[PDB]
Symmetry: D2
Subunit: 259 residues, 4 copies
Amino acid sequence: MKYMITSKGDEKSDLLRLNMIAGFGEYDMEYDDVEPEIVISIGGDGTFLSAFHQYEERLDEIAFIGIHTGHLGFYADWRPAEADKLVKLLAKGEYQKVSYPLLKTTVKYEATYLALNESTVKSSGGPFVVDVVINDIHFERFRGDGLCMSTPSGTTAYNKSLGGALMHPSIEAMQLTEMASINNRVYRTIGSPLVFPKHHVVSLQPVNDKDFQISVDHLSILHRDVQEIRYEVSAKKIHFARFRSFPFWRRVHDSFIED
Amino acid sequence: MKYMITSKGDEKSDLLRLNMIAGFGEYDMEYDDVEPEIVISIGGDGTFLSAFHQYEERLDEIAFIGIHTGHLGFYADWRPAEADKLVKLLAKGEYQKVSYPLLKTTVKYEATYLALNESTVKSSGGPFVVDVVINDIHFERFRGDGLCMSTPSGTTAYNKSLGGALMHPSIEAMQLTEMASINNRVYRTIGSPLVFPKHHVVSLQPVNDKDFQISVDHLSILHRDVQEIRYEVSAKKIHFARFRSFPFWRRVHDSFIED
Amino acid sequence: MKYMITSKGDEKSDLLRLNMIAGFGEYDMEYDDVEPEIVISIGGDGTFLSAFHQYEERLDEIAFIGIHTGHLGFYADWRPAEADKLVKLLAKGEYQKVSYPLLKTTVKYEATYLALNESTVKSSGGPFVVDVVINDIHFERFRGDGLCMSTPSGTTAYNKSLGGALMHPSIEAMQLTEMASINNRVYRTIGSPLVFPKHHVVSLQPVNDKDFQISVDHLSILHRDVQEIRYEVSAKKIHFARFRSFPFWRRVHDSFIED
Amino acid sequence: MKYMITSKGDEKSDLLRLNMIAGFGEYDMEYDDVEPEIVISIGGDGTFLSAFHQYEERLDEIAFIGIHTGHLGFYADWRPAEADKLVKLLAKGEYQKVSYPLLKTTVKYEATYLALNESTVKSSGGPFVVDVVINDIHFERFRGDGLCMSTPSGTTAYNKSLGGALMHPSIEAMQLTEMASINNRVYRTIGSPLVFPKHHVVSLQPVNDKDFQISVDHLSILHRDVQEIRYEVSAKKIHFARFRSFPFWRRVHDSFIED
Ligand SMILES: CN(CC#Cc1nc2c(N)ncnc2n1[C@@H]1O[C@H](CO)[C@@H](O)[C@H]1O)C[C@H]1O[C@@H](n2cnc3c(N)ncnc32)[C@H](O)[C@@H]1O
Ligand SMILES: CN(CC#Cc1nc2c(N)ncnc2n1[C@@H]1O[C@H](CO)[C@@H](O)[C@H]1O)C[C@H]1O[C@@H](n2cnc3c(N)ncnc32)[C@H](O)[C@@H]1O
Ligand SMILES: CN(CC#Cc1nc2c(N)ncnc2n1[C@@H]1O[C@H](CO)[C@@H](O)[C@H]1O)C[C@H]1O[C@@H](n2cnc3c(N)ncnc32)[C@H](O)[C@@H]1O
Ligand SMILES: CN(CC#Cc1nc2c(N)ncnc2n1[C@@H]1O[C@H](CO)[C@@H](O)[C@H]1O)C[C@H]1O[C@@H](n2cnc3c(N)ncnc32)[C@H](O)[C@@H]1O
């Protein structure tokens, strides 16, 4: 079927990509990087994140597969030595598809973004102060370095370093964590991470400065004259092609405990 | 309809209970503490926790209501001055019912328990060492003070003090948090809180000592010759009688930010 | 004696400053903002921080006094209504002097800085990776948002929001805290805050990118072609003019617990 | 000189102890476990902790040496294969002595205790509530699982698992850390670890229940009718016999980062 392969760009990944293309030539597989039905990422989690955003407008028609030649490879569930077995199983097809929830970010002044890991907000230089509104209800005034809204699969990423909880991706939710919040007699935040279900809307509203540095996964953009930053669980989902059992908690164990 | 009222036992609660019973006498409401359809708790969260466990074998036939004369009152959404308005609205009925997930705890040597807040495990004196098995997969060996498995509505309770995240109760899940885990070159745990969906089973298995102090909400029991402690989201749910809008996040805001 | 008064610049502080100058005119007090022996700061902790850096080259000849018209005022131990009593006590003199330790920061490419609160390091855009060398011994490779080295009196400031401990200022030391460190199977940091005594030298050395954003208290400067960032307890100390008992732990209690 | 050797009691330690005694027989070294000038501990940190408390009334006349046959061995700076080299260097003598600060705990109803790692307080069953008084000044009312007061060398032990900072042992100080404190609209603690210098006195005073479980390093004792628990840096110090350079931060690196 229609497929494409992205590469980290280094020697090991560029070479591995060519061998898989040569192997796919022995089957009824057409290379097409415009409308691929299967996107193969060869590299690290950053490479996989690039492949996702490269095709984030055809997520309902694409199944992703990660091969890690990098260092950690959380979204990758294939080693380079297993590449030929992956080519054959992919050709036969009839695999299983697994879907992870995604995060929608809306910035009004309006631009929308889609995240696989998380979306964070910081100030453009001065102090960061925003009012946190949950479902039109004012919840807190946050003063600190910033805030991080994570997907379930993103909870093992930036969310984890901020003290957030690790969520199983079958839970359609988003998690808000704090970055170095000020808490004294005058300033007060919840402190704890917050896990929101589907259809809950978290809105960040400026207090004084209206310029923020907003990141969505890898890319980070300076936004000016911001009136509102809106977070919610996206209706879109990323789809993985799973050819064997690799449970999320074993993936967590192998990445943080021992492998 | 059939109802009963439990009281913290102090003067303000005992007196308030009598006035509500007298007010219910003016309607078609029968007092029955054997098969009540509505259980009213007058006191704090501990009193409400006692009322829940007093009727934990008729949860599918009971709607709970909390009136706080105590200090914090997280499960209570009524002030004592609103008691007469609650009597009338309760008599007319046709309110809305809201369900929160519960935690099932199984201790094999077999006894099962039901928690509204959380269930924790500690050692009976010596060091606490357990293997954490998730869905038959060994995830980690925990060494520390203990572990805490919380319900969604329990995340604002002991779970919060342990650094856990606050979850909305519409999310059918349980959250495992650590108590002072040892982490060095030799010993290693995930550190982060873990949020598990329905049908996931977390099993604690002893390494040396087999005696543990197991708590379920308020009650704490010493268990001997323990072979396994099993956690999972219960199939049973607690039902609340809601007569107005009191969102969970506003309940959180009023309890931790300001009220 | 020779004195000067700095002001937050708002109406309440500008007016209060003029009244104190008028009151000092009734004594043998000469206003001199070139070589003052007593520097009075009227405003918040940011105003006091500005006054300190304005005279950081005459710290051995200056005693500082803080009057808070702002919001929190941690370095201030005088309310505006007590200003006239402060003028009289200051004129009579013979007060007690109290010294807090300071932090020295050296940036080699060489520039040195002096901090009253803390000095932090972040990346200039890309990922932040530095080797942490303690007394010429390689301790760890840090990957994350950045690092924060705090003075004792600065431990209640940025250091506190990063999970650091609060130290009494009689302890000549500095405290290093982490900002969102990456910790997995591959990357590993100590996690815990580190408290270093006098004459211990903490050195940050770049791994790839050599451009860092270095902050010293309020000011934040972009440094290019950095070869080393060096932290150590300074030999210089800030001196306060104390006219009554205001213990550090009561100052902490009033700022975070209740006042 | 006069010496004694304590052993973990297992086969490897019991055998290693006999070989060192046989080696010491070739020098002018007299075995004496009543008034030893040098105490050698063969085992883990628990064995070393037992040796310290076994001779805590002759600390000014004893230098300690740790040999680790156990798992981690933080207070040990000798491997079993280096035992013969240790015997020779010990016989020649003229080594360097290094002193670490200790913690004094006073329990009034009066009994005093000496700690090398830490002293902790928990409740005897019910909820733990104590008023924290610092230098006769009421600082906070603590509600939670308990409190932990650590020595400098103990900061890498229980103190570390509670989020406390790691302090260099040249700093004569003690560090108080919290165990799962309750913090809401009504209950409030500092949250942060507190580092106290010499001559500062931290006093815990009961609010309702007067029975506490008090631990000093390994031993844990139930105390009844407690009126006050008093913490302060002890005037006594533990002395180590150091035969080479093993800096504290390298000891920390080897125990937590990699070795
Ligand atoms: C460019 N990065 C690609 C990625 C990823 C990644 N995704 C996961 C994941 N889902 N689960 C587990 N590990 C993951 N990694 C792994 O992140 C580690 C370093 O990035 C590598 O080990 C990846 O293998 C962007 C990511 O940088 C993260 N980040 C940004 N600052 C961070 C910070 N201070 N602390 C923690 N994360 C941070 C942030 O999540 C951002 O999206
Ligand atoms: C007897 N207690 C009744 C309750 C409750 C309660 N439930 C909630 C909730 N769901 N959300 C928000 N607050 C809650 N409280 C509020 O807990 C506070 C003190 O107990 C009061 O302010 C209650 O009002 C049992 C509970 O003690 C808790 N606990 C046990 N040690 C705890 C600890 N070290 N730290 C934190 N919690 C602890 C534990 O949860 C146990 O179930
Ligand atoms: C411009 N600021 C002036 C100051 C100060 C100050 N010093 C103390 C202190 N010693 N003890 C107790 N409170 C203090 N404040 C109080 O800080 C609060 C907000 O700044 C106000 O309530 C001050 O009253 C610079 C300071 O911003 C701090 N900062 C920068 N980001 C921070 C962050 N994310 N989290 C926490 N602190 C941060 C950082 O320390 C920096 O030096
Ligand atoms: C019986 N123990 C002997 C000791 C020690 C020890 N001392 C240090 C040290 N100074 N620095 C670094 N590691 C150390 N260990 C190492 O502690 C680890 C396990 O005990 C082993 O790896 C030791 O090698 C008593 C100690 O148990 C500790 N403890 C009690 N519960 C604890 C907890 N939940 N979390 C953390 N510590 C705890 C507590 O400190 C108590 O004194």
